[PDB]
Each structure stands twice: as structure tokens, then as C-alpha cells.
Structure 1
């Protein structure tokens, strides 16, 4: 059975592969089928054993948090050889081998997706995807939870922002298809997220069930257009997140009551009515992480877990208390919250992706050790430099004669770090590098914290005697469970003397900082805070490299 699913896009399995899926399915107990539904998270901290993911059930997949590539490779061998059914092994490879709170600790940090989008060259996104999948597959990853095809409509949203390809649906489609092309070259499944679409609300689904409140027609013309394009392009998997679309839900079910409207991860109207029905998506649907507030607050958990599967999800991403969660699935199956027929259909789509990857027939469980040499390879580092060269964007340049910088125009610089990270020693490694590279050019550079500021004992004339230029290094990065990535001062260090001392503002992440420093006359978006982008920033400030980036978003955010 299931030939109508498994023989067509995005599965395209052969007769013999479908026979393996069916024979395997029939051989599984209900407990084993329920376990296939679960992806378990894995971390590398002493006292934590990866095989703990198998103490309470036999999972269908795992996801690696960021730890070292060599440990990931060892974990893959241990996990797979201990598993009767091969595992899907997922990773949040968002920005290359490393970067963005996902990936691996020591992979290549290429760029944020928005930095890639600023190049306006889809080859940049293809290269991004190649790095992610090339470095991931070397250590055993076969599933990247990317690309993000959210639209960065709302500039106050803290969980979209540089994780997106910006606010233009046509560019999102171009870039996401290219990212997927790069991944398929290395045998890694992709995941379009976050369905039904982040970026309309200004709130984080990590902390609540956020709401895409476009009209049904508006949603269909934007998010629906993007999802349809990636589905037709062959997207293998899709992540249903803890976001509501009430107006689309009511289009499917006009009589639904407000309290019955569920987020994507729990919604039959969105997963079965829209995705399976209207869009004929035939790939694997997984939930976003189930311990997040957007999920937990929407429904009692014991009902929610089987209901997600019944309503169209094939896989639950992560457990809270694993004994309790598995018991909830067992009881949901026995009492009819989850049907045996829907259980078999979910597991068929899980096993089908394992057969698509040819995991059952793989003699070795990881590639040869030789494959590890791709990680931080010269090719990958080179692509990161090219993308930085093409991405950095001169947004506002209303300071006559400021650029290019020269020690003979502005010898003494005060460097002002602004960030929501908490690096040991107070200063970001990348800002230290930037400071050192300015000094190499011949500038004298002090941190804001090292020199006096105007006050009862120090005047603005003193400041002007001691300071020729202020430079701001702003890195307000996305991170789960933040309600803002707005500029926060750590407010005397803000650009409060722009008419008395020339001030230059550099953002290495959030592209909307003109919201909080509108007085600034020269403003540059770099989208990514890594070594490659810092070095290329220096080249461009000194006038040895042109500014080539094009804003993939409106950096002024409506003035």
C-alpha cells in the first residue's frame, strides 16, 4: 500500500523501496510505530548520554544541537548501529556548518540568510546550501531543518529578521530553491519552515502562539504562493509551527469557533485542508519543537501530542518529559485520539524518507574520514568571503566626505559595542578583530568604556579634542525566547553627539537599527557578525572594496 504517496514527488521510490517500507511497517509493534513519530534532541555535555534517547521508546529521528563535528560523527555511528530502524539525523544548519545557534560548533559560518539575500545572487544561496549539506553530511546529518521561507514583513518580529531572505516573496522563492539545490547535491533532505508563516506578527512563537492575521486572500497571495512554489520544486519535508492563521482556518471551516482555532502544529484545517488538500503537499510534515510555549499553551499536552499526528503531522519534534509524552501517545492510540490508520500513514511517510536516503542499504553509517576535510575547507571559507563582499549594504550616506575612512581625516576613534550577547571579557571576538584591523590601518581606537564622556568634569569640547570619529558595532542577534532584538544600551553610549562628532553606525545583524538610531547620518548593514564580514567591512570602509549589497528589506521600517 501507499504507492500513491511513495511513488511520486518528493519520494519517487522504486518498487523494491516501497516493498521495504511496507514490510518494515507491518513488522513494527504499535509501540515501535509510536516511537518512529518522535524526534529526540541530542546535546554533548558530560553526564549526558546520547543513547538516552532510546530508554523510553525507539525514536524515528534525532537532532544534534551545536557541538563538535568529531563528536557528531561519533554520535552518528553509535546511534545508527544501536537502532533497528535507521534514524533521520537532523540539524539546524541555517548559516553554513556553523552560525545562528544551530549547526556544529566548528563548522564554517558563511552568512545569515538575509546577508545571502542582500547579494541578490541565488548562487550565493546555492553555495550556502552546499556548505550546510556538505559539512553536515560529513558527520552523518541527513536532514537540515531549512530553508526558512518566512517573509520578514514585520520589522519588530525578533525571530524572523536575518533568518529570512527578506521581505520580497519572489526573492525568497529564488533563494530558497537555490538553497535546496545545494543541499540535494549532498543527499540531505530539506525542510521548508515555518508553516503557516512567520513574519506578520511581532511576537515569538517560542513564548506564545503567534498569529498570522492576513486575510485568507492576502495570505494565499504571499505565503501560499511561496509554499506552493517550494512544494512544486520538490521540498521533501515541511515544519508546521506554533503559529495560527485564523482567517485561512475560517476559509476552510467557516463555522469554526475562535477557541477551536489551533496553530499549524495542531490544526487539521491548515495541515490537511490547505497543505495536503489544496496544495497537494506529499512530503513529510514535522512539528516545530513541542516544548515551546506556542505549542504547550494551546491544548492540554496529553491530548495535543496524538492530536498533532491525527490532524496531519507525521512527526513530533522533541519531548518534554519523555515517559509522559510516550504514554500520552500510547493512550491516544488506544482511546481513539489517534487512529491506527493514521499512525500507519505517518510511519509510512517516515520510513519512505529513510528509504529515499537509502539508509537501510548503507553498509557504512558515516562517510569516510576523508569527508571531514570538507569542514572549514578553503572552498567554503572562500564562499563566505565572496558573500560578505557582495552583501554589505551602504544604506544611508549623508555625511559628506566621511567615506572612505582615513587616519589623516579621523585619527582618533571611539568604538562602541552594542550587543545582546554576553561574551566572556565583555567584548565580542569579532569586535576585537575589527578593533585590531582599524589599528592596523593607522587609526587610534579606544573602547567607549576606556575614555571619558561629557559630564560635570569633561566637556563636549574636550570630547572633540580627544575624538575624531565614533564607530558603532551593533550585534543584536536572534535567539529563542527573546521578545526583542531592539537596540538596548549597556544610555550615555547611544549616538547622542552626532552633530558634534562624526558618527558611523555598523549593524552586523539586525537590519532595522535605524529605528533606534535615526539621528545617525551614515549607516551600513552587514547582516552577519563573523570574521569574513568584519574583514570585508574594513576593506570597504577604507575604500579598497566597493559597496555592492542591495537591501532585501526596507531598512527604514516606514521611517
Structure 2
């Protein structure tokens, strides 16, 4: 009865709207940065001003997407979302964000979590529910009402440069289960949740932020793999689905002349009526809100005009155009007017029937009602909301949950002869080796805390940051002088130099530092009989670059420690495991291809060791 009433209420509201108001609802810009009158370049928008408010009033957007620039502090964020809602003249805004967890988070003081592939490694679907719930509680306190999560892309291409650890797994069922539970956790907190990126960005070797990716698989494979987690979550009540700016010729082989070079390009799914209306809306029965991935991404913007992209997306059946134009000052505000006018022209000619617009706006209003955005529910003063949010966002209970999840997710891939845990005698020298200073800092800070809390004996620490470096005699000397060595490896696409199965360690410049340098540290450590552990920091495929190692773990998240804050929990969790102060329970959620024996799997999906026992979980 409540669903029936909601549909009627949405129809009645939309029937009273002007076309300008309806088209406004279908736009969701960002105002990441803004250049006020008198300023010389755009700056992070952390506080509302009357210029941005005037555009909200004028164009009556349906929502705003927030980025990290906009949500640096809990206090400022509550003030900003209250001020955005104050600016919205008739209908409360969807205020959205990419708070995925792990390597994609935005909240400056929020709980980061270890991320989706870490959740895959930990396996249990309630962990995903907990993650969604806590993220949802934090967003709700901040006045953010929509989360563009979960990613239910299946990372079956290890070379994928944009998904990677943002995916739960290369396995469809594990991805589907964890996606469903993330979604339910968010929805339970009255946060609208979007599945991303339909119809599946997991197989791409190109990042849609930089170019237009192609997925060439046939329909049978796409239905069996890519579509599977979307279908399960749609059936279970997904609120929103975000598109992928990716070509799928098996679904739609329509071509367009590219604005970039005049060539025929296959249509991106975002602009495909066959994919968004034929497949998503009709075949798969999704009646919720379809939102584009950001339209400024080069997969779209290199190839289609700004107005054209929005019109084509709506023609394809999307309900919301995300980031349709970047307006960073009042002097550029006509970019919005031009998008609206292009949509009006399409409605006037009948290319987009006005009834299609009404149906889309009804979906948006219905979601706003369903998730308690409209009517607005919270009568607390801003000061009251701020005080409440500061006790919730990044709370100690949330940090405790984060720590437990990150520690569970750690995956031990090798531990020969009880190399781990390290049990250093007092005065031991620990050498900490990682690509970037924030990463060595995170390892250092975690060890410092272990000493302070008397969990390990006092040891001395030194750091070696190796990004863009060549391994030199000075580095070998540090290895020789160390008693224990912890090295972090960082890869997106794993691309060691390999010839006939032999990884090339003869490279003597810095051109391949991500593989050459940590292998050189490993070689020196083994030659000098030093306890050595390799921690894989981002994509776990770099484990195949260290077969010679006696100890190897994967943590699925690379962000370090900066300005007194851990940017992710994954490195600390791995360091805790190394020193016997946490219990890894992770098993691989992806296969790790061999590098030395091409075509073979080095570590299979499901593999992980008990750190104490050295045997499989």
C-alpha cells in the first residue's frame, strides 16, 4: 500500500512541475571547486556561497555529487549539506558521493574501511552489510543521502586500471553476494544505493576516465558473468544503477562519428538505448533510477559534445545525467542553460517524448520519498546536527569495526618455516621499504605503536621510499645492515619485464621501478639471510613477482599515513599480522596469474594460509 501511494504521490508532484523543473531534476552537477567573484582560480568548495546557491535556485537540480574537496571535515560537511538543502527551492536534493570504502572514499574524517576486494578476501556477506551500514550511518549524520556504491563490477581482467580492488572478486557469486549485502546495509540507513557500473566494467584494460574502453565478449558470456550481480541486486530492490562508459558491441553495435578524430566508434553503454532501455529497463526489469557515470570522463567527452552527450543519455533511457557540465564560476553558468535548452529542443521535436521525462522524474521523486529525503525529516538545528555527527563519523566503534575487517581480510600467500610472525629481539633494526613516503610512514607508525603498547620489543626503524628510484649500492648496504625487512609492492597493471619466464633483474635504470626495485631488495635480503616479507599493497597480482620470497601477504589497499591520519586500514592490518598481533583470515578473491610460467595460475581463487600453521584456510 505504501508502494502504491508512493507511485501516486510522485505522479501528482511531477504533474504540477514545469518542463524546466522536470529537466532540472534530471541533472546532478558537481561543484567540486568554485571561483567566486574576485578570485583568480577555482578553489575547493567547502562552504556554500550565494553564487552557487543562485544556480541551484535557477536550475533546480535534482541533486549534487560531492567530492573529497567538499567534505574535508564533519562540521563543514553538515553545514554544507544543510546549506545546499536551504538553497534547493522546491524539492530536496539528492546529495551523492562515492563512499565505496577502501581505495575510494571521500569523507575527510570518516571511516575508510579496507575496501571491496578486502571484503572479497574476508568472504562473509555480513561484513559487507556492516560496511554498508556504518558508511550509511556516517553519510546520514552528514546529511548525505545517496551513495554511489556498491561496485558490482567483476574484476576478471587483472590488467583493469580503474576497477581492481574496487571489485569484490573475479567470481560472480562472491561479487553478487557482497554487492547485495552492501546495498542492503546502505538502504537500511535510508541511503539510496547505486550499483555500478552497468553492464559491467570489470573486464576492461582501459580506464574510462582517460579513454573509451571496449568489451568484446558475446551475449552469453556477458549474461553469465557481467550481468549476474546486477540482476540479483535489481531483484532484491536496488535503488539506482550507474552506467559504464564502455562499448559492448554484442549488446549494441551502433556507431557514431567521434568528435575527436571523425572515426566510427561503437556507442558507449551510457548512450545506448539497447543497453539502458532494452536490457536494463525491459529485460532485467529495473524500474529504479538510472544515472550516468560522470559525463566529463574522457570516454564520453573526447567523443561527444557536452549537450549531445546529455541528450543521447536521456534518449538511451537514463533518468539522471551526472556531471553534465563543469561550471566553476558564474561566468560559465550558461553551460547549464545550454544543456537544458538542448533537452527542451529534443522534447519539442518529439525525439524525447515529454512522457519519458515525466516517467524519469517520477522515478527520481519516488526514490526521494522512499528513502526519506522528501519531505525533509530532520528538524534539528545545524549546530545540533554538527554535534551529533561529530560523535558518529569516525567514531571509535566504527574504527574498531574497520580494524577487525581489515585484519580479517589480510591474505597470507607464503610463510615458509615460520618466517612470520617476526619476533624481533630488543635493538633489532627493521628496514621499511615502500614506493611512497606515506606508505613507509604508515608501516613506521604502526610499528611505533606496537612498541609503545609493549607488544614488541623496542626496535629501530629506517625507511626506504623507492618510487622512481634505481636500486643502488647505498640501498644494498641498508639491506645488509637490517635485521628484518618489510617491503611493500604497488601495482595496478602488473607489468614486470619478463623473458622466457625469467623476470629481468638486469635493468639498471628506474624505468621499471615498481617491479625491479622491490625484487632487488628481496634478492639482497635473501642473499644475506635476512627475514623478508613482501606486502602487496594494491592489486594482488604482484604476488607473482616474488616467488623467491619466504613470506608474502596481500592487503588490497595502498593508502598510507599523512597529516596524522591513516588513509586506509590495510597497511596497518598487514603490519599487525607480520608482528603476530592480528589474525589474517583472507583467501584470494581472484586468481593470481603466474609471471614465470605464462598461462598458468600461481595462486588460485580461494587460496590463503593460516599464518601460525602455514597450512591453507
Pairwise TM-score range, normalised by the shorter structure: 0.7 to 0.9
Q: Which of 493, 506, 524 in structure 1 is aligned with 2:535? A: 506
- Give a deviation string over 1:495-542, Cα, whole Å, max 9, x none: 212531443211233212225445434211112345644443333222
Which residue matches 1:523? 552
CA distance in 2, matches of 1:449, 1:192: 37
Q: 1:93 aligned to 96, 99, 114, which one?
A: 99
* Whole-angstrom distance in 1 between the partners of 2:516 and 2:358: 62
Partners of 2:115 and 2:165 within 8 A in 1:
yes
Q: Deviations over 1:272-323 (max 9, x none)?
A: 1111121111111000000001112343333221121121100000122434
Contact 1:390–1:549 (CA under 8 A) maintained in structure 2 = yes
Partner of 1:430: 442
The answer (yes or no) to whether the contact 1:307–1:338 under 8 Å persists in 2 is no
* Structure 1 residues 63 and 429: CA distance shift in structure 2, 3 A: farther
Distance in 1, Cα, partners of 2:19 & 2:445? 56
Give how far 1:493 is off. 3.7
Match of 1:324 in 2: 338
Task: Give 2:612's aligned residue.
Answer: none
Which residue of 13, 21, 31 maps to 2:3? 13
Query: How many residues in Structure 1 have an aligned counterpart in Structure 2?
Result: 525
Q: Which residue of 1 aligns with 2:428?
A: 411
Residue in 2 that maps onto 1:389: 407
Distance 2:175 2:57 in 1: 41
Distance 1:525 1:121 in 2: 18
Unaligned runs of 5+ in 1: 1-6, 479-483
Tell me how large the CA RMSD over aligned residues is.
3.1
User: Is the 1:395–1:555 contact (alpha carbons within 8 Å) kept by the matching residues of 2?
Assistant: no
Cα distance in 1 between the residues matched to 2:47 and 2:78: 19
**Does residue 1:466 correspond to 2:493, yes or no?**
no
Task: Rate the CA distance shift 1:549–1:35 in 2: closer, same or farther, 3 A.
Answer: same
Q: 1:42 — aligned with what?
A: 31
Normalised TM-score (structure 1): 0.85
Which residue, out of 284, 287, 296, partners 1:291?
296
Taking structure 1 as reference, are residues 443 and 86 closer, same or farther at Cα in structure 2, changes over 3 Å only? same
TM-superposition CA deviations, 1:444-499 (whole Å, max 9, x none): 3212269x99867x796x666523333213456x8xxxxx5868638874321253
Deviations 1:72-121 (CA, angstroms, capped at 9, x unpaired): 211222221222111111111111xxx53433111111221111121111
2:17 & 2:378 partners in 1: Cα distance? 24
Structure 2 residue aligned with 1:3: none
Q: Does 1:353 align with 2:367?
A: yes
Q: CA deviation at 1:176?
A: 1.0
1:238-277 aligned within 5 A: 238-249=241-252, 259=264, 261-277=266-282
Q: What residue is the counterpart of 1:206 in the other structure?
A: 209
Shift of 1:405: 0.9
Q: Which residue is equivalent to 1:362?
A: 376
Within-5 A mapping of 1:3-402 = 13-15=3-5, 17-43=6-32, 44-45=44-45, 49=49, 50-51=52-53, 53-54=55-56, 57-66=59-68, 67=71, 68-83=73-88, 84-95=90-101, 100-249=103-252, 259=264, 261-320=266-325, 321-364=335-378, 369=385, 371-372=388-389, 373-398=391-416, 400-402=417-419
CA contact 2:413–2:552 (8 Å) conserved in 1 = yes
In structure 2, relative to structure 1, the CA distance for the partners of 1:248 and 1:287 (3 Å cut) is same
Hey, what does 1:550 align to over in structure 2?
A: 587
Name the CA distance, whole Å, in 2 between partners of 1:371 and 1:449. Answer: 40
Q: Give the Cα–Cα distance (whole angstroms) in 2 for the partners of residues 365 and 65 of structure 1.
A: 26
Distance 2:269 2:471 in 1: 53
User: Where does structure 2 lack aligned partners over 5 or more consecutive residues?
Assistant: 33-43, 256-262, 326-334, 497-511, 560-565, 595-600, 603-617
Give the conservation status (yes or no) of the 8 Å contact 2:122–2:405: yes
SS where residue 64 of structure 2 aligns?
strand
Are residues 475 and 132 of structure 1, via their aligned partners in 2, closer, same or farther at CA, if it must alter by over 3 Å? farther
Shift of 1:242: 0.2
Greater displacement, 60-69 / 296-305:
296-305
Say if 1:239 and 1:288, in contact at 8 Å, map to a contact too: yes
TM-score (norm 2): 0.78
CA contact (8 A) 1:76 1:365 kept: no
Q: Against the structure 1 CA distance between its residues 455 and 162, is the aligned structure 2 distance closer, same or farther, given a 3 Å change threshold?
A: closer
- Residue 111 of structure 1 aligns to a residue in which SS? coil
Paired residues of 2:155 and 2:167 also in contact (CA < 8 A): yes
Cα separation, 2, equivalents of 1:361 and 1:299: 37
- CA distance in 2 between counterparts of 1:240 and 1:114 reads 21
2: CA distance between counterparts of 1:177 and 1:80? Answer: 30
Does the 8 Å CA contact 1:150/1:160 hold for their aligned counterparts? yes
Q: Is the 8 A contact 2:435 2:465 kept in 1?
A: no
Which residue of structure 2 aligns with residue 4 of structure 1? none
In structure 1, the residue matched to 2:519 is 495
Aligned residue for 2:433, secondary structure, equals strand
Separation in structure 2 between the aligned mates of residue 394 and residue 52 of structure 1, nearest angstrom: 54
